[PDB]
Write a protein that binds this ligand. Sequence first.
Ligand SMILES: *[C@@H]1O[C@H](CO)[C@@H](O)[C@H](O)[C@H]1NC(C)=O
Ligand SMILES: *[C@@H]1O[C@H](CO)[C@@H](O)[C@H](O)[C@H]1NC(C)=O
Lengths: 181, 190
Amino acid sequence: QNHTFRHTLFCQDGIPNIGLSETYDEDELFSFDFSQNTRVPRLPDFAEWAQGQGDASAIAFDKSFCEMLMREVSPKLEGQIPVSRGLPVAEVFTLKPLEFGKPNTLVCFISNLFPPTLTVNWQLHSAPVEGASPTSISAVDGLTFQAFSYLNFTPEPFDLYSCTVTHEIDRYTAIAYWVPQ
Amino acid sequence: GFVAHVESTCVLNDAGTPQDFTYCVSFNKDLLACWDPDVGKIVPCEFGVLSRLAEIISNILNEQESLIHRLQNGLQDCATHTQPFWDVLTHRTRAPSVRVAQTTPFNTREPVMLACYVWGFYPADVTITWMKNGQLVPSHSNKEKTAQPNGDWTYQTVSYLALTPSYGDVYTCVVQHSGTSEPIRGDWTP
Ligand SMILES: *[C@@H]1O[C@H](CO)[C@@H](O)[C@H](O)[C@H]1NC(C)=O
Ligand SMILES: *[C@@H]1O[C@H](CO)[C@@H](O)[C@H](O)[C@H]1NC(C)=O
C-alpha cells in the first residue's frame, strides 16, 4: 500500500549543529556526512544507492536556508519566546531473548529527543564500560528525533547495565536500567 | 537553542508511483510554511505568534527560481530518486523467530504467565494468537505492544498469556508475519 520516504534536514546550535536524515517507514535509510559531503548507509545493504542520487544542489540550498535562519531569526527572538524542549526517555532491552552465557546485544532506545543533542554512556554497576557503538540520531515523524546505542555483551545472572543519556550537554540526564529479566 | 527543519516528505505506493509531495520549513517546533502545488507557491501555515516570520520565510523561498522549479518538478524526482532501491525496500523481509517461555506473573492471579517472544522481523506488521490444545484462546490479559523498532532495521515484540498448568495441556503461540506465508509456532507444555 503506502510508504513514506522522509528527507529531513535540520540545523540548531550544539552537538550536531546540522544534520540530514532520510528514512522510509520510519527506519533510517542513511544520514549525511557534511564533512566528506556524502550520505552514510545505516546498513551496507544500502551503500550503492547512497552513492549516486547527485541531488547535492538541493542539499546545498536547503543547508544554506537552514543556517540562514539560525543566523538571523534566532538572535532576534532568543529569550523573546520559549524553547520547545522535549524531555528524553530511555529504555533498555536485548536484541534477542535472554540466554545466559550466550552472546547478546543491549539496546538503549532514546525517544522524545528534542533537541537532537545528547551523549550516551553505559555502565555496569556504575563501573563505566566501552565497546558501545556510536549513538545514531534519526529524524522521526512530527519533527522529532530518536536515537539508539547498541552494546554487545554476554548476559549473566548478576549483571546490571545502565544507559545514561545526558541531554543538552549538562541540563537533564536520564538513566535506564536493565537487569536479567 | 532553536532548531529548524527543512522537511520534504515523499509518499509513494508499491511499484514506485508518487502519491503526494511536500516541502516545509519549521523553526522551533512550530511549523512555518509549506509548498502548495495548487497555488504553485510556498504558502504559510501556523499563524501563531510567529505569523509575521511565516510570510517572510515563504517570500524568500518564493523568489528563488531553482527552489520553485525544484519543487514544481518534485513528484517526477520522487520516482527517479527512489527507483533504484524502491523494489528492494518494498520487497525486503526478515522472517520472525519465536520462542515461548514462562515469566514472573504480571497482572492477574494465575500461577503461570507465558511469554511469546517474537523477534528479528521486518516489516513491523505482525499478528500473534494463542492456542490451548489446538484451540484458539480469546484475549484477556493478552497484552502485547506495538512492535518495538531495533533501529537494526528489525523489530520485536512480546505476547503474554496467563494460565493454570494441567498436564496434557499444550499452549502454542501462532505468529503470522506479513513477510512470510508460513505461520510460525512455538508450543509449551507443563
Ligand atoms: C496513502 O494513504 C492512503 C491509504 O493507503 C492512500 O489512498 C493515499 O493515496 C496515500 N496518501 C496520500 C496523502 O496520497
Ligand atoms: C556486535 O557483534 C556483531 C557481530 O559480531 C558486530 O558486527 C558488531 O560490530 C559488534 N559490536 C557492535 C558494537 O556492533
